[PDB]
Amino acid sequence: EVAKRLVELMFIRSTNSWFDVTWRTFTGDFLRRVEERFTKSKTLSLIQSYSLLDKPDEAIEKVFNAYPAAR
Amino acid sequence: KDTYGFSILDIVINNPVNLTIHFGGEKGKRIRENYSAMIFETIVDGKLKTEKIFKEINEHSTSYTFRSEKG
Amino acid sequence: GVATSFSRKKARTFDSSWNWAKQSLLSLYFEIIHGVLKNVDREVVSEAINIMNRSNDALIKFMEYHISNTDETKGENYQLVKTLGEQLIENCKQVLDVDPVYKDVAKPTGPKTAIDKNGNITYSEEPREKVRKLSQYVQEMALGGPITKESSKTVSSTIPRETIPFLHLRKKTPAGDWKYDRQLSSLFLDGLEKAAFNGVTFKDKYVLITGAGKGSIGAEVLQGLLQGGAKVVVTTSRFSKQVTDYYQSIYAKYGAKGSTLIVVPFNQGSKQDVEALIEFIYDTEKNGGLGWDLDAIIPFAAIPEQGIELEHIDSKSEFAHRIMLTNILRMMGCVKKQKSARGIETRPAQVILPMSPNHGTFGGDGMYSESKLSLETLFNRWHSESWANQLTVCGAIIGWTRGANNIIAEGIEKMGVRTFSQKEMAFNLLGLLTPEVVELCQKSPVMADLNGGLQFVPELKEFTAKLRKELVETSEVRKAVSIETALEHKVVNGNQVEIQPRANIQLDFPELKPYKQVKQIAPAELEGLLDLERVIVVTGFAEVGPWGSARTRWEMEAFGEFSLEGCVEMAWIMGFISYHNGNLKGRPYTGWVDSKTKEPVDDKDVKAKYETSILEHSGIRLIEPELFNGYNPEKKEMIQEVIVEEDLEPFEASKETAEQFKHQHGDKVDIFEIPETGEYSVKLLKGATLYIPKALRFDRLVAGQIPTGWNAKTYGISDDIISQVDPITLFVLVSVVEAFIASGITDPYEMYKYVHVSEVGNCSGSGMGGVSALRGMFKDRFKDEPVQNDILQESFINTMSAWVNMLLISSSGPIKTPVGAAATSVESVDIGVETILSGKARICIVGGYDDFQEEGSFEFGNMKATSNTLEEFEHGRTPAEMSRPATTTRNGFMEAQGAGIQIIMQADLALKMGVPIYGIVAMAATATDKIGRSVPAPGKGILTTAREHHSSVKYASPNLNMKYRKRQL
Amino acid sequence: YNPEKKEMIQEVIVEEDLEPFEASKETAEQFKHQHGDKVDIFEIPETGEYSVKLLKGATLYIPKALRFDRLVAGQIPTGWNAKTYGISDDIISQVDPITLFVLVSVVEAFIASGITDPYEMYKYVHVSEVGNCSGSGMGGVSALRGMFKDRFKDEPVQNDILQESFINTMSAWVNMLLISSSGPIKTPVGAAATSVESVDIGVETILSGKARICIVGGYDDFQEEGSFEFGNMKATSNTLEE
Amino acid sequence: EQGIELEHIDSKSEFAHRIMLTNILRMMGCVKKQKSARGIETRPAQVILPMSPNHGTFGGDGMYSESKLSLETLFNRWHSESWANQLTVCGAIIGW
Amino acid sequence: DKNESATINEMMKHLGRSEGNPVIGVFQKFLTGHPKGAAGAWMMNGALQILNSGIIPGNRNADNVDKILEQFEYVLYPSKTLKTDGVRAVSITSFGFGQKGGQAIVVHPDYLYGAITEDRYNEYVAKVSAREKSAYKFFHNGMIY
Numbered sequence A: 001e002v003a004k005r006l007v008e009l010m011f012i013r014s015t016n017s018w019f020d021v022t023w024r025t026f027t028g029d030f031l032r033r034v035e036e037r038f039t040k041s042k043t044l045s046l047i048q049s050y051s052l053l054d055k056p057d058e059a060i061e062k063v064f065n066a067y068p069a070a071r
Numbered sequence B: 001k002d003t004y005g006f007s008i009l010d011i012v013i014n015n016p017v018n019l020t021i022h023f024g025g026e027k028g029k030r031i032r033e034n035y036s037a038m039i040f041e042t043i044v045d046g047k048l049k050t051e052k053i054f055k056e057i058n059e060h061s062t063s064y065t066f067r068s069e070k071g
Numbered sequence C: 001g002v003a004t005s006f007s008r009k010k011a012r013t014f015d016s017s018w019n020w021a022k023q024s025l026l027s028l029y030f031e032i033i034h035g036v037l038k039n040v041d042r043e044v045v046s047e048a049i050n051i052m053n054r055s056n057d058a059l060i061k062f063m064e065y066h067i068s069n070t071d072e073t074k075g076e077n078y079q080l081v082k083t084l085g086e087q088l089i090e091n092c093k094q095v096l097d098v099d100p101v102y103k104d105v106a107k108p109t110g111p112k113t114a115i116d117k118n119g120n121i122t123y124s125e126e127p128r129e130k131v132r133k134l135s136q137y138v139q140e141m142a143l144g145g146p147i148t149k150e151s152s153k154t155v156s157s158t159i160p161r162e163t164i165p166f167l168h169l170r171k172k173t174p175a176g177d178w179k180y181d182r183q184l185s186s187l188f189l190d191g192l193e194k195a196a197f198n199g200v201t202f203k204d205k206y207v208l209i210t211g212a213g214k215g216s217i218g219a220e221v222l223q224g225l226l227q228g229g230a231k232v233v234v235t236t237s238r239f240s241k242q243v244t245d246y247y248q249s250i251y252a253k254y255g256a257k258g259s260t261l262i263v264v265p266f267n268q269g270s271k272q273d274v275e276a277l278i279e280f281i282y283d284t285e286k287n288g289g290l291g292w293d294l295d296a297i298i299p300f301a302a303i304p305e306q307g308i309e310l311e312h313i314d315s316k317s318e319f320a321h322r323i324m325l326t327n328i329l330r331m332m333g334c335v336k337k338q339k340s341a342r343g344i345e346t347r348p349a350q351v352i353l354p355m356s357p358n359h360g361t362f363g364g365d366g367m368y369s370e371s372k373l374s375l376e377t378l379f380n381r382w383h384s385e386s387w388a389n390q391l392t393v394c395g396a397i398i399g400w401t402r403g404a405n406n407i408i409a410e411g412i413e414k415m416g417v418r419t420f421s422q423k424e425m426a427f428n429l430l431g432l433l434t435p436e437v438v439e440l441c442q443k444s445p446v447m448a449d450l451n452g453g454l455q456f457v458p459e460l461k462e463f464t465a466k467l468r469k470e471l472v473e474t475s476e477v478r479k480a481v482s483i484e485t486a487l488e489h490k491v492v493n494g495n496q497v498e499i500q501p502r503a504n505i506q507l508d509f510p511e512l513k514p515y516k517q518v519k520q521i522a523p524a525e526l527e528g529l530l531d532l533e534r535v536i537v538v539t540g541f542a543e544v545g546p547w548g549s550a551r552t553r554w555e556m557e558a559f560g561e562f563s564l565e566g567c568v569e570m571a572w573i574m575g576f577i578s579y580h581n582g583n584l585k586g587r588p589y590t591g592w593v594d595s596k597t598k599e600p601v602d603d604k605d606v607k608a609k610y611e612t613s614i615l616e617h618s619g620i621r622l623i624e625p626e627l628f629n630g631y632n633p634e635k636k637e638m639i640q641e642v643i644v645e646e647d648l649e650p651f652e653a654s655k656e657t658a659e660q661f662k663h664q665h666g667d668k669v670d671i672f673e674i675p676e677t678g679e680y681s682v683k684l685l686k687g688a689t690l691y692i693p694k695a696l697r698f699d700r701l702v703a704g705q706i707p708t709g710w711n712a713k714t715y716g717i718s719d720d721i722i723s724q725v726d727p728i729t730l731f732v733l734v735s736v737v738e739a740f741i742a743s744g745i746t747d748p749y750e751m752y753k754y755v756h757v758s759e760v761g762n763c764s765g766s767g768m769g770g771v772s773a774l775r776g777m778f779k780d781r782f783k784d785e786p787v788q789n790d791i792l793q794e795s796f797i798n799t800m801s802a803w804v805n806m807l808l809i810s811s812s813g814p815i816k817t818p819v820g821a822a823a824t825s826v827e828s829v830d831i832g833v834e835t836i837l838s839g840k841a842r843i844c845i846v847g848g849y850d851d852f853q854e855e856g857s858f859e860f861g862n863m864k865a866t867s868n869t870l871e872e873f874e875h876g877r878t879p880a881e882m883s884r885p886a887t888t889t890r891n892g893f894m895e896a897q898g899a900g901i902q903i904i905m906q907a908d909l910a911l912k913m914g915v916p917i918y919g920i921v922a923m924a925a926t927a928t929d930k931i932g933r934s935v936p937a938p939g940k941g942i943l944t945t946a947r948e949h950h951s952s953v954k955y956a957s958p959n960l961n962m963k964y965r966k967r968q969l
Numbered sequence D: 001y002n003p004e005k006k007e008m009i010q011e012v013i014v015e016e017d018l019e020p021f022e023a024s025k026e027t028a029e030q031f032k033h034q035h036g037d038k039v040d041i042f043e044i045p046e047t048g049e050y051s052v053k054l055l056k057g058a059t060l061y062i063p064k065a066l067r068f069d070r071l072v073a074g075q076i077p078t079g080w081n082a083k084t085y086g087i088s089d090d091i092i093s094q095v096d097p098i099t100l101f102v103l104v105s106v107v108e109a110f111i112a113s114g115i116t117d118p119y120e121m122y123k124y125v126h127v128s129e130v131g132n133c134s135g136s137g138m139g140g141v142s143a144l145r146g147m148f149k150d151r152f153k154d155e156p157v158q159n160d161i162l163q164e165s166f167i168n169t170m171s172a173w174v175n176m177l178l179i180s181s182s183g184p185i186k187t188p189v190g191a192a193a194t195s196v197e198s199v200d201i202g203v204e205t206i207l208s209g210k211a212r213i214c215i216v217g218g219y220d221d222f223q224e225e226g227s228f229e230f231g232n233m234k235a236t237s238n239t240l241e242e
Numbered sequence E: 001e002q003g004i005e006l007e008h009i010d011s012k013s014e015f016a017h018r019i020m021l022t023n024i025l026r027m028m029g030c031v032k033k034q035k036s037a038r039g040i041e042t043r044p045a046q047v048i049l050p051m052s053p054n055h056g057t058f059g060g061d062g063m064y065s066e067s068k069l070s071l072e073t074l075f076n077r078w079h080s081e082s083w084a085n086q087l088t089v090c091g092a093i094i095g096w
Numbered sequence F: 001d002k003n004e005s006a007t008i009n010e011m012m013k014h015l016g017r018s019e020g021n022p023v024i025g026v027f028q029k030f031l032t033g034h035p036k037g038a039a040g041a042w043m044m045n046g047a048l049q050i051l052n053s054g055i056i057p058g059n060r061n062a063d064n065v066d067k068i069l070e071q072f073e074y075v076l077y078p079s080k081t082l083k084t085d086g087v088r089a090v091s092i093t094s095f096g097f098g099q100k101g102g103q104a105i106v107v108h109p110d111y112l113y114g115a116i117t118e119d120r121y122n123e124y125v126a127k128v129s130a131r132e133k134s135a136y137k138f139f140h141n142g143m144i145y
């Protein structure tokens, strides 16, 4: 819900892009924190580059499919 | 001692409950042969049955054990 | 190093193979059903072999129940466990009376050394392609290879003509030199084939093995001996909890029926220990010995020597030589002396001497070659001295065994030289304990060569050096070239995020399955049959104990270690880590910090930084005076009444204090005003009564203590409450809060949304209550130390319940504090169940609590109910293993402290509140034993809970049938 | 126990070395263990004993007497003896006075029930069906005084004084001297309300059916320390004011 | 060492073994160390080791056979270690 | 220990428990030690955890089971944890001084839910889910602060 709210309030659908790169970094940092919280051991970050958040619905779906306990 | 590898003096003195004869080495093999040669012969109905005392003891028996309840 | 290490009290006996067989069966069963073993691999076969080796009628019935009660429709895994267990039941019935046999079924593995492109050396034990069974291993040893050649049917038939098998026995020629012998070698290989196929028994074989620690050939030999049924005395120079647990695990895995493992501390470098161990082995059980006569001696104890050439021979090489030669000769002589004193001429002990093929060919090994080479004198000494009838010499020339020296094992295998694993070498050595090789040793000493043909390579030392040099140079060249190529690429072309775990502690509410799944298991007639108001459910629970909360205690109980969440919870409990949020060293930090240094600590680092301290200061451990007000059981403060023999020097005191002294002592004290300052001088006279402190060494030094650093402030109990109530009350308050949290009742008043204040009871209690307050009132008040005036109410057993209600609950429901000594918590659950069933409450706080203190500890020591720690130390027991229930050596209970609380209530109300249900309190009963004069003596009084009448049971009750009861309903 | 002369001990620091006094080897070793370098202990070769010499700075306890203001108590009549009811001297030496009071009360209560022989209850019920649900507010306070004070003073105290201090010990002695039941045992603590607690728990036990007969009620003993701490709380009446 | 069989190996046998084997190895090590500290590579000392033809043939001689037999490791150690240039091994198997 | 094993064995024998079906004996005090009245509560906590996780911890201090306990064929004494596929009921037994014997039985919670309707179970489950979320929130907040 936090990730979805962040995408709703920081990613513009009409322009299909983040309104600000700092906002994009904010959402990516939150997702990395989610991965840290819900990963049981060492693992590659699902968001390796912040540029993947140009499709934020897809990035959120991937992250929370990998960590369904966070939904 | 020479034949069956046990001490009648020791048995009288200590009244052991169990007594293990060991058949290791040449002396032990000779004692084992003495034990194996021991037979119970009985002429029953005109037939000379030859039961073997210590049926356990064979060429591969490393030891025999005399058992008693109290001594 | 000559320091003594052996003691009889420290020896540990493992003989409960019956129990270990049942345990191993359950472990294998559950692993198969859970899929840890999808197929029948050699580990499953070996575990089945251990079960068979321990097979007895009780084990057959155990298996029969657990395989017939298995239902096969619950997926293919259950069908697999059923068929496999039926096969195992059949196979155990066959060997019900057969002797246990050592049968090794692991895949033979050879060496594999690989150099990556970046010059990384990797060594692996890959399975051999050609050889896959131990039978095939024996065939390969018989066949040999090209290098070993020189200018219905047993495996000794398949040996090629004019060849030397990899494993052979030699014969001493009349010239005095040992040569390969076809007859003896054939006998040994035939014994090896019989062992590989049928398995070899070691029943009625008493073995003394030294140098059998983890990762040694002796460990595998000991495993095989235990499989075969031997009575093995294993020695260890590293006697500790880790080593004793390792040997217990080995006995529980491979300890066949009739096998006994005696783990003793031992220093083979000290002749006192050599003599003492042999005396302990040979002494009668009445005199504290074992009453054993050794059939085999396997002195594999040794210490390494690296980089010790001739010029470096010194203390270490002398001590090593003592261990490897002189004390083995002393041990052999000690066994000879025991057997001769007992007049034992016909039970020789087979000494399996570990011999090296190479005596100084490698060098730089100190005195190792000297020891191994001198060990060959025993062949001639056996003929030339008068100990032949008590010991038989079996020199096993042990070949290259894979445990630096492994990266080139593949390289030495490339010319038909054969290199062995620890399992293969142990199998070769146990082949020397077969009855035929035993008889061969008794007829004359034997020289088994298990060298794998290593002797036939010329200049083996130089060849090994060249192999290592080639591998090293290849690795280094590849690494350097890769690094330089990487640097060149980075220079030419100019310049993955890793996610670490974060602790997410879960409350562990019960998993709620789909309705269909939960209905499938309960009977279909249960729907509406039960009065849920009359069904009691443990809605919540928690505890404060020597492993912290219920979660961390359960983690250490089940898995034996803390996960990330458990470790972070323990660090937070102990105050090792605190939470920080805000600016820290300038930059903004949010997370755990070190409580003392305030430095940031990451969750991944919490374990690495606090695991040792957590373990050291959790669980059963040495009593910490800082946790019991400077109570040191080693220095237990006392006072002795003495009569004063001469007047003391006057000392100043107040008017009131001097008057109290005069009131006490009467004419045996003089009190005088001091006009200068108005104070008083007190002068005790001859004959006055006096108390001098004295200190007593008390022998209960260990207790199960709430982990060091536990604070009620950490949970949020205010300092005023901490100063008011006792530590027991603090434990109970934290347990109550955590139990409501486990219930999900974050606010206790939310219970009053569903029930009346009169309907929430508290039926927990203590065996002894506020012992700290009792000590206050009985001792510190006697000493006139500052004690709160209301320490009396803080001593009551019901005071903790009162503080719970009047800090958290506000209930006006039933309060029934039980005392039951160690059974007060079950008493509490029973009382709470009765309260809910009567309806005087709907929710009840049950459980129990107690505190560890000096005086309770001392009185338990006075009754000898607790275990004497000095006796435990004499037996080599650490605090972690002090408490050993249901063991042959248990000698008193281990005192602990803490609290445990459960929130129980009606099932109907639990469903209505939507609270988790961890279990149904189906029954709760208390009982007394009988008439007798011993208060702490247990009894069968609770057996009445299974009371039943069986005078007429020819037909089943309709009342026990649920369909009948549902029809009536 | 005379409340007018209530015995306490005052810690003082030794100002001058005391004259040596004889002590056993073990006793002198304990003194040395306590005081460290503030005591010298020396063997006497003539007799093998030890001389103990406390030095300047050593810690020392002088008895002192405090005039306490609760002089009156409701006491069982003077000359009450459990032997008068027939409890043997061995039981009297084993158990606390509270236990003796409870045993006499249990016997008299069964007499009032007309149950002269307690096993006659087993003609009607199972041994599992006779519970004891009485309890105490503090229980064996005499045994608590034993373990906390006379053990501290090294006076002769029985090794099983702790089990004689428990609140369930009296009911245990009742069962294992008179009842022999294997019925429910539920010992409540309620301070002054433990007897109503006991009646309520006994009623619940019988209604649940885990017992058919129940010994309920409650018991306590008057001792120096409990008296003093009630005085400290000012819950009791000040006799001097009275 | 007379009448010291296996069961009689004790302080005397251990001391004799020290003299006959261990302290000879120490003496050769000491000579090696002196020569190496002085940089002497071309003047080896010829160690004439007293070796026995019989290693346990007679028995009852403590650790004599052990000392003599272990003295034969020096042949291999000479090749396998770095003291070849300072000492040469000459095992003389002394007869009756 | 001897008395408790004998009591459990007599209970199984009299109740006619199947042969070769020993009760698995959990001994918590090897790890926690003996509190003089928190003991039954700690064992009840462990019994509930065993019920919910299906995991039976072993008595890791059981270096060698006493031979006299072999006579009690209805008792098993594990030394290592067992991952069972389910525990139905657990018998918590305590024996305090003063002849204070006590036996409680905790059944798995899932045998309760078979006594209610589908809808009641569903609404209960939803309510426990919400409560679990709220309790996780409270627990973590209270831990850090």
Ligand SMILES: CCCCCCCC(=O)SCCNC(=O)CCNC(=O)[C@@H](O)C(C)(C)COP(=O)(O)O
Binding pocket: C028, C029, C032, C042, C044, C045, C048, C049, C081, C084, C085, C087, C088, C091, C103, C105, C132, C133, C134
């Ligand atoms: C509930 C758990 C039960 C699982 C039990 C299943 C396995 C058994 O029944 S063990 C009975 C004994 N079986 C054996 O000894 C076979 C060992 N001998 C063998 O030759 C092979 O099994 C191996 C050596 C292991 C390998 O042989 P293979 O190549 O597989 O033919």
